[PDB]
């Protein structure tokens, strides 16, 4: 029992997050923001397939859940139950409002309906990483998740190694020369600016 | 061959907590009065605790601080009660120690029917000559890094002065 997404598609008002003033907000539908084999190192999922928005719109939490289930449902079936790691990079913080009828607009200020996620042009919505032989399994599964989102979205396969900020063609040599240390989902960048005893902790 | 890195005692703090107030508190003041030789100073409650039966701004405990050669005589008398025995946990991380007793009669105080049993609580503050920088008026400052008293250094000072037989744990 709610209004369609056409009413709240555009970013019309200022950001209105859930805070001390904005209280009494019902809980967002999306709770888990990443699943799969999330307990995995960065050496086994070097694909980094991304979902990139193309408009300046609002993405609701139930729309994120709709594209979370359908992308995950086929992705388990395609490569396996633990052959992937997916994330959603929109956390819905903006709170939309209702002017509920039973008077007119005599003192009409809105009541929270739910959360919604503001997105910019070119900002990543959904990120999927897996092995190299599941490239076409990720692209067409993300096409299935496009139908759960309003507006136009485009599919881009990034050149980044996993969910890190480093380029995938040159991720290996820093590991061998010891400038990068993996720690679970991410990697540790080691500058030459710390104490030299930290350098003596490695290189031995 | 250190000139004045010798570990002396800065103060000996004595406090008695009768628990609530009143006639029990003021009768325990005479216990600490004759033990030291100076007028003790009471202490107020910080706030209200119905669990312990105290309320705001209440005379709970009485405390006194002893300096000079009077402090070590009390410390030497208190270690007779404790059999020259301490524990590893008694020493603090700041290189100080202390212990609590249960009966003041064995400290040379004669028993009284009205003035009943009141245990003590000892805490020893070790120090070096030069520790008064952190609490004087004009030119304050932290007392070094290797000039501080560590937990390990406080253990061996007791073992050479009073033949420490401290059990582990």
């Amino acid at each position: 029992g709610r209004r369609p997404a056409r009413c709240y598609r555009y970013c019309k008002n200022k950001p209105y997050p859930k805070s001390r003033f904005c209280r009494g907000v019902p809980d967002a539908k999306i709770r888990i923001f990443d699943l799969g084999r999330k307990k995995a190192k960065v050496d086994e999922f070097p694909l980094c397939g991304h979902m990139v928005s193309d408009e300046y719109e609002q993405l609701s939490s139930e729309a994120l859940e709709a594209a979370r289930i359908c992308a995950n449902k086929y992705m388990v079936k395609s490569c396996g139950k633990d052959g992937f790691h997916i994330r959603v990079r929109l956390h819905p913080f903006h709170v939309i409002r209702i002017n509920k009828m039973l008077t007119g607009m005599r003192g009409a200020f809105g009541k929270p309906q739910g959360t919604v996620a503001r997105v910019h042009i070119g900002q990543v919505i959904m990120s999927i990483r897996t092995k190299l032989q599941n490239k076409e399994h990720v692209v067409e599964a993300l096409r299935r998740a496009k139908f759960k989102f309003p507006g136009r979205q485009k599919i881009h396969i990034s050149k980044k190694w996993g969910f890190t900020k480093f380029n995938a063609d040159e991720f290996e040599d820093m590991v061998a020369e010891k400038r990068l240390i993996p720690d679970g989902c991410g990697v540790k960048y080691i500058p030459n600016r710390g104490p030299l005893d930290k350098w003596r902790a490695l290189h031995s | 061959e250190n000139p004045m890195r010798e570990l002396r005692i800065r103060k000996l703090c004595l406090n008695i907590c009768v628990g609530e107030s009143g006639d029990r508190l003021t009768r325990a003041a005479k216990v600490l009065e004759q033990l030291t030789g100076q007028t003790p100073v009471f202490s107020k409650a910080r706030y209200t605790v119905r669990s312990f039966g105290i309320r705001r701004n209440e005379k709970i405990a009485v405390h006194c601080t002893v300096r000079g050669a009077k402090a070590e005589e009390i410390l030497e008398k208190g270690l007779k009660v404790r059999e020259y025995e301490l524990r590893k946990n008694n020493f603090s991380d700041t290189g100080n120690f202390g212990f609590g007793i249960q009966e003041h009669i064995d400290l040379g105080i004669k028993y009284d029917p009205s003035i009943g049993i009141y245990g003590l609580d000892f805490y020893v503050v070790l120090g070096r000559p030069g520790f008064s920088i952190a609490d004087k008026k004009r030119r304050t400052g932290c007392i070094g890094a290797k000039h501080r008293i560590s937990k390990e250094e406080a253990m061996r000072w007791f073992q050479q002065k009073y033949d420490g037989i401290i059990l582990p744990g």
Partner: protein
Amino acid sequence: FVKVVKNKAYFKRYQVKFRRRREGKTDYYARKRLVIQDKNKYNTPKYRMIVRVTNRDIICQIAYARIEGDMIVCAAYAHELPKYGVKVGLTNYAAAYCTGLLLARRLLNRFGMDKIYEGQVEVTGDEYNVESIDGQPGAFTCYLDAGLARTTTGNKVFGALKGAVDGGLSIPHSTKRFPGYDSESKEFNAEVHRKHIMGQNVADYMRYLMEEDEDAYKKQFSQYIKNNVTPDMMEEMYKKAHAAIRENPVYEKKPKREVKKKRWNRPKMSLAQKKDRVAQKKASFLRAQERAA
């Protein structure tokens, strides 16, 4: 484990206090009240009586604030008193009076009022103040600076105050902090203040020590014995010291000999040496594992 307080964010938010505040010398709350002038005065200097009693000396100075830094027009130290005939006891109340007296007489010498505003010569310890003489240049005025010193009754900071006032400096003050002002009966005894100025409070102590045991007398007043100072002769010794200040308060500079020009301190290490050290340490560490393996 528990949270570390001094993290990166701690030093980012941390605002350091003033350099003299961090060192702990200047009380900046009282400084604003002391030295700042009224804006309708238009660069009229506000002279201040700086007294700083250290462990083995007493420093008395006169200052007024310019924007580049306050100007010490005249100064007087307690270690100059041996020239006037004070061999020992340079950090006592009596020496505090002389260095306060020395600064006032020295200051009057520069501006040209040695003869005018003589002050107290028969010094007693009662209330005294300098009245401006009509048809004459005005009496000098300044304000006492205790700094961080606890201003209780009988402090040495007020001893230099009495010396400066008797020297001929019009400083506003009361008799509440002078030694002799009885706290409970609320009256000032001038005879008690005279005893501290001439130093009979030290004389009574040294007479007390010689009677009760001799060896503690040797320990306490060591250089007093070496300089042949007995309680009988100190009063006129100070009067001669007080007298000798009066005729010649001017200060002569010590001649500067040619400097040897050698560096006792360790100089700052350069960047190239900084870069070489870490490379050398890395090379030594790398060959250490090679020898081990």
